DNA sequence: CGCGGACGAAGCC
DNA sequence: TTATCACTGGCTTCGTCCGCG
């Protein structure tokens, strides 16, 4: 019931994501320092990834009053009864008068306080609800102070609504709790198997026009970057998932598709200037009922190095992952992808010739 | 401990540059490289039998080779972050750049302080800054065992020597 | 008289520079993160700093403070260091974080 | 008779329990700040996979419900220490924007930023249950069978849910040391009130400093404590623990069938 | 839709691109100090091969303000009209009063805190933008606080031209988010094959005119260099390339000379002292359609030597090539062209006789 | 029509 | 260079209103 991945993957002078002031992450590890790849980050990757295969988008947002503002104007509205309308429809929820909205900025739509996490055809269906209320809104907006017309239960019902991203990865909105839907995915922050310490780069940027003051004296601003190989680790509680999603059909189609674009996804940090885009060199998956196991324990030793980490890596995560089969008995369905030929890794279980095989034989045991 | 070598190589060496061309010019080949590579061996004529993990090493031969590569207006317990600071303020070089680059050497790993390292210390030396080696000396070797520790201290005394030297100016 | 004036510089002097080592320690991690410091900075500090003030008031000879004499003698800015460093030792580590942390140590100098 | 087990959990950066602002709870010990994930959190997470495992030995073996009226048993006869890390550990801040979807003509001005503090480590975690008062308040002993047993076994699998689904910090125990002793629990805490030095990571030496303690605490008392001990790894031993099992579940059960 | 690069080039006792201190950027990758040849520099020498080529050319620089007041006194303005005229075209842009400026330096106009990427052309219309209006700046001259008078739509407008390499690589304006373009083009670090320690050259400049004892002291500087196999990789995101340009024929000579150049240039980061101009030994192409895949992790484990690394080098890349198609399975259109005959290499796909031939194929079965 | 659950009334600036 | 910087709660008794059965 618990879909587990493991993945080693390089990334080369990659800084894919950055602190506040550029450089990656890092977690002094082991006693070793070890840049890593936040968890978020990469998350919010799969989950692009995830709802561009699939067709159905989730929008994460804190301007939902300007957005229906727009779809009412194209609805033939006029733009103050938009305005007002939608105001109406975030004002009509929540315990006091209405959700909190940000000091409104001159000439736009006031942010809404939370960041909001629904479908796109969600956002119409509030344009529609605020839409057949269309004489309440145009009398309450000359009042000083309006309250909120729109029935509060058809549009809690709405903002209900699920996406696959939300049945996967879960929501939570303060205001509302009944909205609120637990994630069914534990993803790890990927840190690297070996030491990195973040090498400094010194670049310059060129003025075309030549100017004497423009060369010799003047220097350019230092830029951090890294490198390194990362391990990956993720869990899916399907039992969950089923329950989110409700059909196991839909819960296996979210799974797949999850399992690949988490393989497929890279977080994209300075991307034009490095181009880190790389596949996994080993993806472990695995099918445990009992409960998920992390392997992050088998890197906490950092690698000494010198030599390269992959292979000496793989090696590690296999031993592990035999010790951790005698230490705890399991029948949990175990598999493996791997590009290096040089090992047979016999503790990963049965080996698979390519990810998408991989992932259609685990899914289809689950 | 290891500062009694390290007091060994500084005037042993200190006294064997001034009064030494060919040795000078045979260890000063070797700055920035590893007692491994084969340009430096001229050098080990001279330090190798002082040298008392591996990390060691490497930071005496560094040192006396980078002490041993400056200019002759350079040549003739507070750290290496005093020793800045105390440049800062009173040669009046600019604070805020070797600002970045003590932040930059605080993170690097054993091999690491040896390559950013010369630039700095080297260019302090330019414009007859104090240093006092043998403490720099232990510190690469400490980089064997306690690199972050010693990276806060040499960050830690720049700051506060900056700061009481600024207020002390009252 | 004297003795209350000698009471009352000194609990002044106390509370004000240990507030002014609040502001610090909150700032400081801060600026540094772009805090936990606070909490156990405070509990140290009270915690050494009352002795010191009951040493102070009995006309005691108190470290980094002079026997019999109307000024406070900023004894306090040394019980505040000790404490600061005691909380924030092991995160002036990184470079930046004890570029922040030092250059706001620096106030409770005076 | 005190069975008591003790353990080294590492944790990957994480921040399973948190104080009331983001830091993860820390005690001062050794004169250097170390990680901690207090015991009652981790108690309540043993409390569920415990009962949800039994499908009334819970108000026994742990002292009462939370959601019921006490009824005059409200100790439980565990004792489960405060997890703590073996070495010195830095909160490590974790700066992360919640990103805006809908963009106006203007670029990157975010959603919400903010920063998170997390951070990992070797967690030496230590329990003990006295058996004698679980024998004469359940009656049946085979009822203390299972629930020994069956919360052994929960004590190695749990871990708390906390920030879990933005960090996977799901994980075993790397050491389990179960020590049937009939004079008194003793816990290895001050082991490691000296924190390891950092640079090459801790499982191993950390398993050998418990060793040592063990030999010498075991000589200034020899007793005829039942012992043995589960490692992740097979490259080292460590005589003083007690013999070798090759896994967690074999062990809990040689220590079950040894309290009997 | 997505055309990636692959590229293995020896470079001699190069020294390409320095550090401040002179030596070479190097990445600790895979436990080895390899040197690099940073992308932002060969990104550069690209750019200028292909706007040099395609007559298109692009303009970064702080010091906007003086050339538009070079074409408008060429226009027939008087020197100081000219220049109230030009920081009137910069003033009455952005959000506050105007662009930010750096301290102005006598006698000259003073440059801009950002820098500004737009083609020559657009600096022409600008100026004739500035042209008419040539009373109201004449007027506007004189008062103590002057106003931006030049209307900001139109000048935004001229401001949101693109070049090719802008298409290509994009730009940023801060000031201006309305001009910015996302780039299309994703450029890696080109890192050594194998491990290269820097090599120190021992260098010293004779003085002409005799001197007894200079003659005998002799004494110099020494600056050091590195040479090696250098891994070459780069993405080119079509979709969002068509995007750019609006047509696809002009996506298409766009990227086709565009990879032409990739393979053309070489940085020239002192040459002038060690000629290294060379062409890659070997390149691969691939047209993706679902992923750019990077074979960069083939050499994270470093090469050991003792013999030529080329061969090896092209070796690994095929082995891995053909791993990843076996791990991966796609429909990406492949193909390559190498010097050495030594191997068939039958992984890289279809093998072209000629590099202008293989670029030509693959652009135009994209 | 009955029962259960949820929110409000201050005291408070 | 610029834009962004969350909510929610751990008080008192009872009555009334509303949702449900």
Same mark, same amino acid.
């Given at each position: &019931?618990?879909?587990?991945i ?6 080369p002078?990659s800084?894919?994501?950055? @602190?506040?002031?550029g450089?990656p992450?890092?977690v002094?590890?082991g006693?070793?320092e070890?840049?890593?790849v936040?968890?978020?980050?990469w ?8 709802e561009?295969?699939?067709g159905?988008?989730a929008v ?6 300007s ?5 009412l104007?194209?609805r033939?509205w006029?733009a103050?009864?938009?305005?007002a309308?939608?105001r109406?429809?975030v004002?009509?929820?929540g315990?006091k ?9 001159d /000439?736009?739509?006031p942010?809404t306080s939370?960041?909001?996490? #629904?479908?796109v055809?969600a956002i119409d269906?509030?344009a529609?609800?605020?839409?057949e209320?269309?004489?309440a809104?145009?009398?309450?907006a ?13 549009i809690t019902?709405?903002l209900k609504s699920?996406?696959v991203s939300?049945?996967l990865?879960?929501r +939570? #909105?303060?205001?509302?709790? /009944?909205?609120?839907? @637990?994630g ?5 922050h990927?840190?690297?198997v070996?030491?990195?310490t973040?090498?400094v @780069?010194?670049?310059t ?7 004497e003051? @423009?060369?010799?004296?003047?220097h +350019?601003?230092?830029?951090?970057? /890294?490198?390194?190989?990362?391990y ?5 509680? #399907?039992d ?6 409700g059909?196991?059909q839909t819960?296996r189609?979210?799974?797949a598709e999850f ?5 497929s ?5 300075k991307?034009?200037?490095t181009?880190? +885009?790389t ?6 998956i695995?099918?445990?009922?009992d409960?998920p ?5 088998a890197?906490?030793t950092?690698?000494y190095?010198?030599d390269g980490y &992959?292979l ?5 995560l296999?031993?592990?992952a035999?010790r #951790? ?9 175990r598999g493996?992808a ?6 047979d890794l016999?503790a990963?279980g049965?080996?698979?010739d390519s990810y998408?095989?991989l992932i259609?034989a685990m899914?289809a045991?689950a | ?7 060994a ?5 200190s006294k064997?540059?001034?009064?030494? =061309?060919?040795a000078?010019?045979?260890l ?12 430096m ?6 330090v190798? =039998?002082?040298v =008392?993990?591996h ?7 560094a040192?006396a080779a ?8 350079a040549?003739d317990r507070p750290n290496?972050?005093?020793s ?9 070089l ?6 970045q680059?003590?932040?930059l ?12 390292l ?7 030396r330019?414009?007859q800054?104090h240093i006092?080696?043998?403490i720099?000396i232990?510190?690469?070797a400490?980089?064997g ?7 806060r201290?040499?960050?830690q005394?720049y700051?506060?020597?900056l700061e009481?030297l600024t207020?002390?100016?009252? | 008289a004297? !003795?209350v004036r000698? !009471? ?6 106390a509370?004000?520079?240990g $507030? $002014? ?5 909150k700032?400081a991690w801060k600026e ?7 909490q156990?900075?405070?509990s $140290?500090y009270?915690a050494?700093?009352?002795? %010191?003030?009951?040493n102070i008031v *009995?006309?005691?000879?108190?470290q980094? *403070?002079?026997?019999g004499?109307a000024?406070?003698g900023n004894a306090?800015?040394?019980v505040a260091?000790?404490? *600061?460093d005691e909380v924030?030792?092991?995160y002036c580590?990184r470079?930046?974080?004890?570029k %922040?942390?030092?250059?706001? $140590?620096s106030?409770?100098?005076?």
């Open positions: &019931t618990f879909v587990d493991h993945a080693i993957q390089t990334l002078y800084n894919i994501n950055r @602190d506040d002031l450089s992450k890092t002094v590890y006693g070793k070890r840049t890593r936040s968890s978020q980050s998350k919010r990757a799969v989950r692009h990834e995830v561009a295969r699939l159905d988008k994460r947002t804190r301007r939902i009053i957005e229906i503002a727009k779809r104007r194209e033939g006029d103050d009864l938009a305005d309308g939608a109406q429809v004002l009509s929820v315990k008068s209405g959700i909190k909205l940000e000091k409104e900025k /000439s736009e739509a942010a939370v960041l909001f996490y #629904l479908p055809p269906e509030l529609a609800i605020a839409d209320h269309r004489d809104v145009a009398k309450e000359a009042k000083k102070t309006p309250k909120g017309i729109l029935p509060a239960d058809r019902e709405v699920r996406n939300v049945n990865f879960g +939570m #909105l303060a205001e509302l709790p /009944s909205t609120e839907v @637990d069914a995915v534990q993803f790890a990927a840190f690297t070996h030491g990195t973040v090498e @780069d010194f670049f940027a060129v003025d075309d026009i030549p100017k003051n @423009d060369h010799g004296s003047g +350019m601003n230092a830029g951090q970057f /890294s490198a390194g190989t990362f990956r680790y993720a869990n899916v509680n #399907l969950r998932l089923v329950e989110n999603t059909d196991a819960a189609t979210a799974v399992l690949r674009a988490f393989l996804t890279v977080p994209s940090g991307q034009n200037a181009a880190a +885009m596949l996994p060199d080993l993806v472990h695995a099918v445990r009922f409960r196991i992390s392997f992050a324990p890197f906490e950092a690698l190095g010198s &992959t000496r890596a793989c090696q590690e296999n031993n592990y035999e #951790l089969r005698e230490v705890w008995p399991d029948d949990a369905i493996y791997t590009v290096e030929n040089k090992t016999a990963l049965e080996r698979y998408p095989a259609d899914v045991a | 401990y290891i500062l009694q070598h390290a007091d190589l500084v005037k042993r060496v064997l540059i001034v009064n030494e =061309p060919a000078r010019a045979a000063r080949r070797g700055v920035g490289l590893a007692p491994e590579d084969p340009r061996l001229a050098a080990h004529r001279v190798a =039998p002082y =008392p993990v990390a060691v090493e490497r930071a005496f031969y040192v980078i002490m041993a590569a400056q200019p002759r207006s040549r290496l972050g005093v800045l600071a105390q440049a800062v303020f009173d040669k009046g600019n604070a805020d750049s070797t600002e680059r003590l932040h050497i605080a993170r690097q790993n054993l091999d690491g302080v040896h390559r950013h010369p630039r700095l210390v080297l260019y302090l330019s414009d800054v006092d080696w043998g720099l232990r510190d690469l400490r980089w065992h306690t690199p972050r520790h010693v990276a201290e040499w960050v005394d700051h506060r020597t009481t207020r002390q100016a009252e | 004297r !003795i000698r !009471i009352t510089l000194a609990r002044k002097a509370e004000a520079l $507030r $002014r080592l609040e502001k610090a320690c700032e540094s993160n772009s805090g936990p410091w606070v156990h900075g405070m $140290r009270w050494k700093a009352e002795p %010191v003030f009951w *009995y006309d005691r000879p108190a980094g *403070y002079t026997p004499m000024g406070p306090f800015n040394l260091l000790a404490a *600061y924030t030792g092991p580590e470079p930046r974080v004890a %922040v942390v030092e250059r706001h $140590r106030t409770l100098f005076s």
